[PDB]
């Protein structure tokens, strides 16, 4: 399935090159620009655990998720991954716990030492 593919075929997008965040582009976005620190970013996403459980989805809420890029409002892998995305891009991320919730997890939804899969669609961003 998709998590397998990004695990096996994804690009390491970390600056450390520690394979902690892997990415594949599912839909190529529009224009070369990518969001920058402080930008208000609007996305749709779905997140799955390594047992296939879908732990969250913005689509299921009929409204996007909004955050300010690069400010630590989200897990590290999102600040890193979303910074790579073009407007309209759909990407998959496969994230080791060091770039997500670590050994603590985030109860009740995210267990300890959880590798996370996301599909993210970047709808828009603005300074
Ligand atoms: O950094 C996050 C990441 C990535 C952005 C989308 C969501 C938001 C919105 O739920 C939560 N956060 C930030 C955050 C804030 C507070 C506690 C834990 N995490 N998540 S998430 O992994 O899908 C998530 C979804 C849900 Cl329902 C619960 C948790 Cl603990 C985490």
Swiss-Prot record:
Disulfide bonds: none annotated. It is found in: Cytoplasm; Nucleus. Widely expressed, enriched in testis compared to other tissues. Induction: By androgen. Acetylation impairs ability to promote interaction between Akt/AKT1 and PHLPP1. Deacetylation by SIRT7 promotes interaction between Akt/AKT1 and PHLPP1, leading to suppress Akt/AKT1 activation. Ubiquitinated, leading to degradation in a proteasome-dependent manner. Deubiquitinated by USP49, leading to stabilization. Residues 30-118 form the PPIase FKBP-type domain. The modification N6-acetyllysine is found at residue 16. It comes from the Eukaryota. Immunophilin protein with PPIase and co-chaperone activities. Component of unligated steroid receptors heterocomplexes through interaction with heat-shock protein 90 (HSP90). Plays a role in the intracellular trafficking of heterooligomeric forms of steroid hormone receptors maintaining the complex into the cytoplasm when unliganded. Acts as a regulator of Akt/AKT1 activity by promoting the interaction between Akt/AKT1 and PHLPP1, thereby enhancing dephosphorylation and subsequent activation of Akt/AKT1. Part of a heteromultimeric cytoplasmic complex with HSP90AA1, HSPA1A/HSPA1B and steroid receptors. Upon ligand binding dissociates from the complex and FKBP4 takes its place. Interacts with functionally mature heterooligomeric progesterone receptor complexes along with HSP90 and TEBP. Interacts with NR3C1. Interacts with Akt/AKT1 and PHLPP1; enhancing dephosphorylation and subsequent activation of Akt/AKT1. Interacts with IFI44L; this interaction modulates the kinase activity of IKBKB and IKBKE. Interacts with IKBKB and IKBKE. This is Peptidyl-prolyl cis-trans isomerase FKBP5. It comes from Homo sapiens. The chain holds residues 16 to 139 of 457 of the full protein.
């Amino acid at each position: 399935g998709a998590p397998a593919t990004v695990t096996e075929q994804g690009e390491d997008i970390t600056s450390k090159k520690d394979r902690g965040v892997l990415k594949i582009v599912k839909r190529v976005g529009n224009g070369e620009e990518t969001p920058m620190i402080g930008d208000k970013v609007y996305v749709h996403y779905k997140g799955k655990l390594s047992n296939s459980k879908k732990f969250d989805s913005s689509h299921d809420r009929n409204e996007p998720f909004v955050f300010s890029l690069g400010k630590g409002q989200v897990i590290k892998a999102w600040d890193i991954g979303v910074a790579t995305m073009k407007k309209g891009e759909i990407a998959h991320l496969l994230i080791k716990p060091e770039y997500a919730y670590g050994s603590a997890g985030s109860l009740p939804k995210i267990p300890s030492n959880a590798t996370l899969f996301f599909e993210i669609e970047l709808l828009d961003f603005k300074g």
